[PDB]
Design a protein around this ligand. Structure first.
Ligand SMILES: CCCc1nc2ccccc2c2nc(N)nn12
Ligand SMILES: CCCc1nc2ccccc2c2nc(N)nn12
Lengths: 208, 208
């Protein structure tokens, strides 16, 4: 059973801005997603200090970047804390509401799209390069979910009956036709070195 | 009753590096503490979405910067999530252990002290300007604590029987004799504008 939801108006407006604005420095999407993964990993690590059973879903704390030319996807995988159904449907959108407003105000004040991460909505920079984003996530004490959106004001959530992940988040970027450079090893390696050099977790770039 | 603890060796080593290294761009301490406050405020806001009773200790989410020439202090106050006794004594030091190692490696690799925030140990940049740091903190379901350190490898924690805060953290910087510029309105305002322009909470700079 697939449920369809409308984004909050402000989020839909943000996504359209991201999709519509002429902005060539698209590569910043990768720094934002890795930064989200790092935050998610910081969260599970912190929580495991007071409750060590939280690592029973997996002890290794890392980030994998997986390009697939056959499927035209770049997947960012982490073993961070994961997201609950409420995160996916309600909670994150509520945080995203005030961030969006500030960001859209800052852009009019002369800021640029690369600063999106300072407003807590960097996940949406995925839409710089992806026609569709699929997010597979698994939080302790909740089921595994698949969230999906090709923008246009709506997203879906289903209970994921695919392959179990243990704990964490996979962001699958279905790349736009003209954005397949982000499937190239040299290109990803360049970007990670330029913007994500000091992340406190191993980042493995998979090869094809 | 005041308890005295030793920092972990790596943290003590970090503090000595911060205190000893010739480094003129000391003003970055303020961006790091405001960033910590913003993170703490993000935390309480997020948690209150699933448990609204968490805001019974105070709904207003903000940052105050309070200079006091008489006491030679600059205080950074937030109404974020606050810290537990275990945070103060154990948990934060455990996170700080891996961050320190990476940071001290990056510095040898050619990085500079301003990048300290990317390694999760930015709190310690307080020692660029402060001879002593006093932290008053109050987390829901725990008592109010005072943490204190003038470095030298040890810190203290006591149950705080001073004035109740409701919920959040006050970082009181007892400034070094030659660092009283950070008590000046123009100077603080300049620094906040330069480095903390897009924080998602009101930051009130108090006057004297
Ligand atoms: C968890 C932080 C990254 C993240 N992941 C998502 C996944 C699905 C839907 C929305 C989001 C989402 N909204 C915001 N503001 N951040 N965010
Ligand atoms: C809560 C994040 C800021 C913070 N506050 C403290 C207060 C007292 C002792 C240690 C810390 C501390 N250690 C680290 N790594 N961050 N941190």
């Amino acid at each position: 059973e697939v449920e369809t939801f409308a984004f909050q108006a402000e989020i839909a407006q943000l996504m359209s801005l991201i999709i519509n604005t002429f902005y060539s420095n698209k590569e910043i999407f990768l720094r934002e997603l890795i930064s989200n993964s790092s935050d998610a990993l910081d969260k599970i690590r912190y929580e495991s200090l007071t409750d060590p059973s939280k690592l029973d879903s997996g002890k290794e704390l890392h980030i994998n970047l997986i390009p697939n030319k056959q499927d035209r996807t770049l997947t960012i995988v982490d073993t961070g804390i994961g997201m609950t159904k409420a995160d996916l449907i309600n909670n994150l959108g509520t945080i995203a509401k005030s961030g969006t407003k500030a960001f859209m105000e800052a852009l009019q004040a002369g800021a640029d799209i690369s600063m999106i991460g300072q407003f807590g909505v960097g996940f949406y920079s995925a839409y710089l390069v992806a026609e569709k984003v699929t997010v597979i996530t698994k939080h302790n004490d909740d089921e595994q979910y698949a969230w999906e959106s090709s923008a246009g004001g709506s997203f879906t959530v289903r209970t994921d009956t695919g392959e179990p992940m243990g704990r964490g988040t996979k962001v699958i970027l279905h790349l736009k036709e003209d954005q397949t450079e982000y499937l190239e090893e040299r290109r990803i390696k360049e970007i990670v070195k330029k913007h994500s050099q000091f992340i406190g977790y191993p980042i493995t770039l998979f090869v094809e």
